[model samples]
Target: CPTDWKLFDGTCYLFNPSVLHWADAQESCMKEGASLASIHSLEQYTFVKELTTAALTPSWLGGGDCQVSTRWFWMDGTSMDFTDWCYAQPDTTLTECCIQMNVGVGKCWDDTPCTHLHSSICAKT
Candidate 1:
C-alpha cells in the first residue's frame, strides 16, 4: 500500500481531498499508478460509501458510460458486475457519464455529468 493509503482486501485505497472533475480525478490516480476506485462487491461499496459519507461529499467512482451509453465500464476497462444505483439513477440523459457515490441519496450511486467536480477514491493493487 502506498503511504497514507488504507488497506482492504489486498488493495490500497486513497481518498483524495480535493474535488475534481471525473476525467481529472482519473488522470490524477493514473499518475500515481492507481485508478479511480472500482467496487466489485457490496462490501467494497459499503466501505467506500461510508468513507465518503464521513467526509460529507459525494465521491467519484470509476464506473462511467461516456463512450457507450448503455454499457458502463470501470476505469480499468472491466464491465460493471455489481451496481448500486439509486432509484432513477443513471438518468435517461446521455450527457451524464460519470458515477458518484452520492451522500444526499444515502450513498447510492448517482449519474452526473463528467464535468461535475467531486472528491475521488484511488485504488491500487
Candidate 2:
C-alpha cells in the first residue's frame, strides 16, 4: 500500500531498519497503521526471516513475554500458533523479554532484552 512495503500472502510488510528499542520499533509501526510483524506459518516466517536476513541485522518481531516470563504473544494480538525459536531460546533468563528474528546463525527467533536497539518489520493487511 506504500513504497517499499512488500506484499506477501495477503499482507503488506515494511522492513524498517533502525536503531530503536523493541517498544520504539513497535511504536513506529503503529504510526504506520500497523504493528510489528507476526508470523503464523512457515511461509510467513520465511518471508519475515528473509527480510531480516537481507538487512544483515537482528530485527524485532512482535513476539514478547508481555511482562509474563515464558508466556509469549505478538503485539498485534494474533494467535500464538507458530514459532521458530532457536535452540534453547526464549531463554530461562527473565531479562530477555522481547523477540528478535534473524538472531545470528540459522536466522531463527530469540528472546532478547527489550531495551536493545534493533530493526523491525511492520505488517498490515
Candidate 3:
C-alpha cells in the first residue's frame, strides 16, 4: 500500500519535512490513514534514527507523557516498552510532553514542548 514510504518489520514509514506542532502532526498523519510513528524496538529506533540523521532534521515520534498519568504513551495508545532516550532527556516537566528523535549525535528521544513545530514521521501497519 506504500509507494515512496520505507518499509521495516511489517510497518511503513514516511518522513515529512513540513513543520507542525505535535498534535497537528498527529492529525496530519491521521488524515493520511496513519498515526505518528511509534518506536517499539531497537531496530525501529535505529531505522528512525538513521532516517532522522539522513534528513538532518528532528522528527516527532509517537511517544509522549501527555494525556497519560505520568508514563509516556504512544499516539496509538500503546504503552512505551522500548526507548532510546538521550542522556538527561525527559527531564522536563510532564507538560514538555512531545517526543522527538535524532536531536543530537545518538538520535535518542528528547522531550520538547508539544507546540513546537518540527518534522514528523508517519507510520502505518
What's the lDDT for all of these models?
A: 0.82, 0.84, 0.82
Q: Rank the candidates by lDDT, best first.
A: 2, 1, 3
Question: Which regions of candidate 1 fall more than 4 Å away from where they truly are?
Answer: none
Clashes of 3: 0
- Tens digits of per-residue lDDT for model 2 on 1-125? 68988889889998888879988999999999999989899998777767654545778988888577777788776977898889888684668888888877678888888899999999999
Q: Estimate each model's TM-score.
A: 0.91, 0.91, 0.89
RMSD of each: 1.5, 1.5, 1.7
lDDT per residue (tens digit) for residues 5-62 in model 3: 7888888888878999998999999999999998888888777666654556888988
Q: Give a tens-digit lDDT track for model 1, residues 1-125.
A: 86878888888888887899999999999999999998889888766665664554788989887887877889876679988888787773679978888646366888899898989998888
- For all candidates, the clash counts are 0, 0, 0
RMSD of 3: 1.7
